[PDB]
Amino acid sequence: KVNEFLSGFTKFEWLCKESIQESIKKFSKNGPTLQNYEDQLKKFSQIEEEIEKIVPTYKIGAMELMTHNICTSLSTWAKEWKLQYSQDLHKRARQL
């Protein structure tokens, strides 16, 4: 049951791979539009919605889990991409 939770949450673990700078740099090399940047910020806010959606806290048999730790991890991981987006926005302004 833990692993079922974990499988539902691999999509959220995607943060760990996406946190690499190379992914955001490939997407930035794509030269996306302002609407695209806004779409990534919005998908990011939706990620945050899922981060607060840590409702499952069922005691796994006779074991109680610490979900707030996971939530905090996800939130920090998250914040990474927003700071990345601000820093690339500034250099777009620079070049153009």
Method used to obtain the model: cryo-EM
Q: Where are the alpha helices (DSSP H) in the chain?
A: 2-8, 10-18, 21-29, 34-52, 67-95
Query: Resolution of the coordinates in A?
Result: 38.0
Which residues neighbour 85 within 8 Å (Cβ) at sequence distance 6 or greater? 24, 37, 40, 41, 44
- Burial environment of residue 74 by CB neighbours within 10 A (0 to 12, 13 to 18, 19 or more): buried
Contact predicate 15/56, CB 8 Å? no
